[PDB]
């Protein structure tokens, strides 16, 4: 909000990014595996 | 050899074996047998004995 914008400068871009990173984490954290990498398909994840 | 396996990673091991060899069958078996190589020192040493 500061910068005005995620893509008007380099903090607020990295600043997005790591919002959006949170949010995934706890979105998809039942998709996430604490050290291995979790893999999916569309049948896995109810993709039509 | 002529067989056309094919792993899907999209399945379980114990499911992607189960399809192999409904598809495949017991030549596939024989075939992984004699990559063994369990025979061929099995006739080499009854020849020598």
């Given at each position: 909000a500061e910068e005005g914008?995620?893509?008007?400068?380099e903090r607020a871009k990295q600043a997005n990014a790591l919002h959006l990173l949170l949010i995934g984490f706890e979105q998809n954290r039942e998709r996430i595996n604490t050290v291995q990498n979790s893999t999916y398909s569309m049948d896995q994840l109810n993709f039509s | 050899t002529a067989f056309r396996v094919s792993v899907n990673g999209y399945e379980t091991s114990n499911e992607n074996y189960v399809r192999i060899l409904s598809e495949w069958g017991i030549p596939l078996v024989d075939q992984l047998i004699h990559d063994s190589g369990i025979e061929s020192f099995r006739s080499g040493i009854g020849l020598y004995l």
């Open positions: 914008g995620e893509n008007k400068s | -």
